Amino acid sequence: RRTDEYILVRQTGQDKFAGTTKCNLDHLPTKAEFNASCRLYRDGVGNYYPPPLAFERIDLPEQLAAQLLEPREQSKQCFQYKLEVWNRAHAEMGITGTDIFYQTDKNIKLDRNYKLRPEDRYIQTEKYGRREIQKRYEHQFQAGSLLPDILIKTPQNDIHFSYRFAGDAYANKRFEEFERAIKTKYGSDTEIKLKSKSGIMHDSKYLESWERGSADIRFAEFAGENRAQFPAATVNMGRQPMTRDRHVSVDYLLQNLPNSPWTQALKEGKLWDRVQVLARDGNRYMSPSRLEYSDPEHFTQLMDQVGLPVSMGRQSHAFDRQAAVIVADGPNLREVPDLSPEKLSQKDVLIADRNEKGQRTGTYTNVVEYERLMMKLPSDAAQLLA
């Protein structure tokens, strides 16, 4: 068990809070203390979830989901399933106040989209401006819907909390600068969490592994600021049964799930026939052998930066199966029919290339290059983007 697997947060003031990490508690909190605190649970990457969200983040097993059709007993059984995971987890962590705090504020009525009216979706701080939230809970503090923007957790597991404001000591300064001054003050092993509108405190490095500059975007936004990229390598985790392609950033995988069987196979040089690597120009994906061959210097730099062994570039089998278009959407590329209607010269769109004979080369190239070189899209690509 991790010594920082929970943090207990308490209100001590107008817009003032204090936290204590599990390992720093000087006493064994009673069930009342547990139930009166905002309880933050550490997930597998060091994000911290308040209770109603930690509970729903328990996922249902594939088999159980399938076996379940019903409905509403559907909700009942999902809840009973998560309730036992939740209860057993609280027992092991030694927590005796196990309230979930999912109860909604029943004085608040939704708009026709079943969402909060704009007048009901803000909390007002005394000194720091307003903050937008996702949901109105009957127990707002305990549900996590009242925390500050920033949680710092030092190498000693001490918690410091912070609010941004328009024109503060970091106005128009970058998250990375705040970050450097934090690790100078506290130690370079210090963790920084940035609050989501939901109440989740996402670790700053988790956010950057999701999209470079996300941590900074979230940081700026707290102060009312606004400021202005394919993954380096990707692995196909789809094509199953055969199922659709789904290419997941290698960096994401290796940073965030260092003991995944995908991650560990990749580290040993396996699954190289499912790996795509970005050209020096940023516009094209190709196999690792193709890149090794066509640009050995960039190959060696990309593979060291991303954490893959250079042996992948001396491998080859004896490409028509691959999707005609892939689309970047976070740290993964998706086939067009996998994106929701709201998701869909986009610089996020990559086309399965074809040579002068009409045959698939295996590469994917950005649509912007098709426009710049005045190259017509292949017809398979062209109809998916219609």
Binding site: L53, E56, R57, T104, A143, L253
Partner: peptide, 28 residues
């Protein structure tokens, strides 16, 4: 939608990928 409506659209995409990637079987 009370199981998911306390989450941001982005928090749900994050979770979806984490779950996908935690439960994905190696190829044969």
């Amino acid at each position: 939608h009370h199981q998911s409506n306390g989450f941001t659209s982005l928090d749900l995409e994050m979770i979806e990928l984490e779950n996908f990637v935690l439960h994905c079987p190696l190829p044969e």
